[PDB]
């Protein structure tokens, strides 16, 4: 089965099933398996997994806010080694944005 890690694959998955695909694990879950971010060993302790599902605090206020809305984020285009600059951002009401420039700019994709 496909390892779903692209902008469209993950966005469609989120809107269709209201959860991330099974290849995503949170930073804390990855650290419980032995992930040490500065070692770049995520694929060694959690083969086929990508970091995703943590709370995204939208610190620069670039994504639209609303009463009751919270956001989360996940890594996109990751397969092994050190993390890259691509992320999907998704809200509790299923709006979906992406960044490919490490949160400098966002594009709405759902």
């Amino acid at each position: 089965a496909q390892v779903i890690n692209t902008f469209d694959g993950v966005a469609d998955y989120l809107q269709t099933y209201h959860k991330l695909p099974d290849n995503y694990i949170t930073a804390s879950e990855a650290q419980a398996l032995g992930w040490v971010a500065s070692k770049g060993n995520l694929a060694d302790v959690a083969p086929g997994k990508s970091i995703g599902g943590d709370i995204f605090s939208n610190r620069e206020g670039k994504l639209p806010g609303k009463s009751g809305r919270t956001w989360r984020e996940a890594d996109i285009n990751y397969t092994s080694g050190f993390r890259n600059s691509d992320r999907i951002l998704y809200s509790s009401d299923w709006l979906i944005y992406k960044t490919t420039d490490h949160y400098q700019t966002f594009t709405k994709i759902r």
Binding site: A27, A37, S38, I51, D54, F56, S57, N58, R59, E60, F82, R83, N84, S85, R87, D101, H102, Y103, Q104
Partner: protein, 90 residues
């Protein structure tokens, strides 16, 4: 341990602050120089334990607008989540 030092009197803009963080924390070359990017790098890039010594904090506020305080707060929130960060404010 990873040690990082900000000499607050040398920070003449928010750009200087983010470029200093990029060097001192050995951040990725793609570093986005913004608060969500700094948060991401504390959460999933930077080496721990980390010791940040931020000297002349008041002077670094002068030329960064509200940047110095918001950056400090990102470090404190990361520490609050369990990152092993020691912050020395002078």
């Amino acid at each position: 341990m990873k040690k990082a030092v900000i000499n607050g009197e040398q920070i003449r803009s928010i750009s200087d602050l983010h470029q200093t963080l990029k060097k001192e924390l050995a951040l990725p070359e793609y570093y986005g120089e913004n608060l969500d990017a700094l948060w991401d790098c504390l959460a999933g890039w930077v080496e721990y334990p980390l010791v940040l010594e931020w000297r002349q904090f008041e002077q670094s506020k002068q030329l960064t607008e509200n940047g110095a305080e918001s950056v400090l707060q990102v470090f404190r929130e990361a520490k609050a989540e369990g990152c092993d960060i020691t912050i020395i404010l002078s």
